[PDB]
Amino acid sequence: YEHVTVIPNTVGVPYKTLVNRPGYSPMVLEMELQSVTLEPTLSLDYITCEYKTVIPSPYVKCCGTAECKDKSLPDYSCKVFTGVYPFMWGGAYCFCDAENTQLSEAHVEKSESCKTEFASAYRAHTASASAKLRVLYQGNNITVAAYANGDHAVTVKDAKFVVGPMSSAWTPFDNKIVVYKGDVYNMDYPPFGAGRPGQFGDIQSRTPESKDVYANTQLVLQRPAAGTVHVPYSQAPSGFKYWLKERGASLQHTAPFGCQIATNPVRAVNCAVGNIPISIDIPDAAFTRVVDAPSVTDMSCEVPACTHSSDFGGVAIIKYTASKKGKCAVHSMTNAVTIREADVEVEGNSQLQISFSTALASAEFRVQVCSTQVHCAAACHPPKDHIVNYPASHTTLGVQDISTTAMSWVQKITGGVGLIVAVAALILIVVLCVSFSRH
C-alpha cells in the first residue's frame, strides 16, 4: 500500500498521520523531524590572508649613482636618493659627503601563515537538502536518513520511504559568501584582481599554495633619516587582519528562521520553512484485517478537567467495551486537537485515560478508535504561564474558533428585524397593488 502526506517543515514536533485501508485495521504513524540539512554549492572564488613585506638590504653607494631595474614581482617598488651621509657605530660609512647615493626597493609576498589561517570567498548559489526522520513503526522508534529533494528513496524494515522535495526553495545563504575558520558571512567581496587597500580582498590568492598572487598596497618609499642607514617604507596597512576586527555579526544570528550553520562541510540546519511531502509504501504484513482487531462497544467519554496549553494539558477518560484483548489505534480527526498517544491495548468492559493538547477555549471533538467514533465535550481554562521554552506547534488554532457559551450569545445576537421590515414592505406594496399593477 502507498500513502502520501505532507507535514510542516518543523523540528521536534511529533506529527500523527492516519493511514487507513479497507479490509484492515487503520493505523496511525508518528513522524518526527530530527534535523534537516541544506548543503549549498561550493565554487571557491579565491582566498586571502595577511601579507609579508620583503625589503632586502638597501644598496648604498659613494661618488657614483645607482639605477632602478624593473622587477616582475607583485607591487614591486624602488626609489633612489642623493646626498645622504649615513653614520654607523664606528663612524661614517664613507667619505663622499654628498656625491653618494642610496637605492632602495621592496615587494610584498604571501605569508606561510596562510597555509593555516586565511579567509576563503566562495560563490555558492544553489543547495541540496538532507534530513533525518524518526518513525513509530510496529511499536518502536526507527531512524531514517535521506535527501529531502523528492528523489532519494530509502528502504527500512520492508517499507519504502520517499521524502521531499522541499516546498520552499528559500535559503539563508547568498550567491557570494566569505568563510573564516568556523564562521560564515554574507558579504559581496570585491572582484578578483581589484582589491581595495584596507578592505577585505586587499590581497588575492587563487589557492593557499599557488605561488602567483595579486596585490595593491601603494608601496611608496621615503627619503631616509639623515645621518642614519636604514630603509623607510610606506607599506599599506593590511586590510585583511583589520576585517577580522570589524567582522560583525555572524550569519548564525542574522539568518531568518535561525538555520544553524556548520562548516566542513558548510550546512544550514534546523530552520522551519515550508513543508515536506512524504510517500510511504508499506507492505501489507504490518496491515491487520479488521476481523483480527477486537471489536469495540459501549463508548462513553468524560473530561474531569482540561487546560489548553503548549503541553498535553488535556486529560480524557473513556469507558469502552471490547470483544477481546488486543491493540487498537487511536486518533483525532480534527486538526484543532492532537493526541500524544498512538494506540492502546483494550481488554473489554474497562476504561482508559488519554492525554491530549488543544487550543480551543471549549474542546468539542470526536475521537476515532477501532473504527468507531466517540464525542468529547469540555471547557478548558487558561494556564498561568505566558511563555515556555520547549517548542510545541501541535495546538494550532485558526481564525475560526469556538465562542463556547458566548457562541449562543452571538447566535442570539444574530436575530434581526429584517424579516418584519420585509413583511411591512410587502404589505404596503400589495395594499398599493390595488393601484400598482406592474411598474
Partner 1 sequence: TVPTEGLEVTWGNNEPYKYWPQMSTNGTAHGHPHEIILYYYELYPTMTVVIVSVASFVLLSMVGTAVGMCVCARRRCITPYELTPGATVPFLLSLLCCVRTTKA
Ligand X SMILES: *[C@@H]1O[C@H](CO)[C@@H](O)[C@H](O)[C@H]1NC(C)=O
Footprint of partner 1 (CB under 8 A): 253, 258, 308-310, 361-362, 379, 381-389, 391, 399, 401, 403-406, 409, 413, 416-418, 420-422, 424-425, 427-428, 431-432
- Our CB check for ligand X shows the closer of 90 and 139 to be 139
- Our CB check for partner 1 shows the closer of 203 and 271 to be 271
Distance CA 60, CA 181 (A): 44
Please tell me whether residue 171 adopts helix, strand or coil conformation: coil
143 binds, among ligand X, partner 1, none (CB under 5 to 8 A by kind): none
Distance CA 269, CA 94 (A): 71
Sort strands 177-179 and 119-122 into parallel, antiparallel or unpaired: antiparallel
Distance CA 306, CA 355 (A): 10
Please give the grid coordinates belonging to residue 53.
613585506
97-156: contacts with ligand X (CB under 6 A) = 116, 136, 139-141
Q: Decide if 328 contacts 25 (C-beta within 8 A).
A: yes
Distance CA 88, CA 83 (A): 16
98 binds, among ligand X, partner 1, none (CB under 5 to 8 A by kind): none
227 binds, among ligand X, partner 1, none (CB under 5 to 8 A by kind): none
- Our CB check for ligand X shows the closer of 137 and 185 to be 137
Half-sphere exposure of 117 (CA within 13 A, CB side): 7
- Our CB check for ligand X shows the closer of 99 and 341 to be 341
- Angle ∠(70,75,81) on CA atoms, nearest 5: 60
Distance CA 147, CA 161 (A): 11
Element (H, E) at 405: helix 405-413
Which residue, 125, 124, 151, 169, is CA-closest to 9? 169
Please tell me whether residue 207 adopts helix, strand or coil conformation: coil
Minimal distance, residue 392 CB to ligand X, in Å: 14
Minimal distance, residue 111 CB to partner 1, in Å: 29
Sort strands 314-322 and 119-122 into parallel, antiparallel or unpaired: unpaired
Distance CA 16, CA 206 (A): 52
Distance CA 362, CA 366 (A): 13
- Our CB check for partner 1 shows the closer of 175 and 404 to be 404
Minimal distance, residue 218 CB to ligand X, in Å: 30
140 binds, among ligand X, partner 1, none (CB under 5 to 8 A by kind): ligand X
Minimal distance, residue 362 CB to ligand X, in Å: 30
265 binds, among partner 1, ligand X, none (CB under 5 to 8 A by kind): none
141 binds, among partner 1, ligand X, none (CB under 5 to 8 A by kind): ligand X
Minimal distance, residue 112 CB to ligand X, in Å: 12
Minimal distance, residue 144 CB to ligand X, in Å: 14
Minimal distance, residue 141 CB to ligand X, in Å: 4
375 binds, among partner 1, ligand X, none (CB under 5 to 8 A by kind): none
- Our CB check for ligand X shows the closer of 55 and 142 to be 142
Distance CA 286, CA 298 (A): 28
- Our CB check for ligand X shows the closer of 72 and 264 to be 264
Distance CA 238, CA 210 (A): 20
245 binds, among ligand X, partner 1, none (CB under 5 to 8 A by kind): none
- Our CB check for ligand X shows the closer of 221 and 328 to be 328
1-60: contacts with ligand X (CB under 6 A) = none
Chain residues in the site for ligand X (CB under 6 A) = 116, 136, 139-141
